[PDB]
Amino acid sequence: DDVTVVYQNGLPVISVRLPSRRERCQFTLKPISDSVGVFLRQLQEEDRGIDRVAIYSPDGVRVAASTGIDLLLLDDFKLVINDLTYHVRPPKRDL
Ligand SMILES: [Mg+2]
């Protein structure tokens, strides 16, 4: 029902339900070279129904697109997809 972050084979896998279908979709990311912007672009490419997507800190401050996925996953964040906000809780990993 929500957005999960699970490490598989050493890499974070973010799983989400996208608005156009029920089938959940997963996004494996490279912490040290992918950015927030890359992930958001992948989401948009996956579902044309997505009009708006953005990531925010738990305090509701927008997270810069250039920020590395490793940094994003140091703490909780919010992922907004159209009119829904997901509270995402990554497992804490040093770095
Ligand atoms: Mg915190």
From Swiss-Prot:
It is found in: Mitochondrion inner membrane. The modification S-glutathionyl cysteine is found at C25. Residues 3-93 are annotated as: N-terminal MCU domain. The modification Phosphoserine is found at S20. Induction: MCU transcripts are down-regulated by microRNA miR-25. Down-regulation by miR-25 may protect cardiomyocytes against oxidative damage in cardiomyocytes. Phosphorylation by CaMK2 in heart leads to increased MCU current. The regulation of MCU by CaMK2 is however subject to discussion: another group was unable to reproduce these results. Phosphorylated on tyrosines by PTK2B/PYK2, promoting oligomerization. Glutathionylation at Cys-25 in response to reactive oxygen species (ROS) promotes MCU higher-order assembly, leading to constitutive activation of the MCU channel and mitochondrial calcium overload. Homotetramer. Component of the uniplex complex, composed of MCU, EMRE/SMDT1, MICU1 and MICU2 (or MICU3) in a 4:4:1:1 stoichiometry. Interacts with CCDC109B/MCUB; this inhibits channel activity. Interacts with MCUR1. Interactions with MICU1 and MCUR1 are mutually exclusive. Interacts with SLC25A23. Belongs to the MCU (TC 1.A.77) family. Channel-forming and calcium-conducting subunit of the mitochondrial inner membrane calcium uniporter complex (uniplex), which mediates calcium uptake into the mitochondrial matrix. MCU channel activity is regulated by the calcium-sensor subunits of the uniplex MICU1 and MICU2 (or MICU3). Mitochondrial calcium homeostasis plays key roles in cellular physiology and regulates ATP production, cytoplasmic calcium signals and activation of cell death pathways. Involved in buffering the amplitude of systolic calcium rises in cardiomyocytes. The selectivity filter, in which calcium ions are arranged in single file, is composed of two acidic rings separated by one helical turn along the central axis of the channel pore. The N-terminal MCU domain is required for efficient Ca(2+) uptake and for interaction with MCUR1. It is not required for targeting to the mitochondria, oligomerization, interaction with MICU1 and MICU2, or assembly of the uniplex complex. This is Calcium uniporter protein, mitochondrial. It comes from Homo sapiens. The gene is MCU.
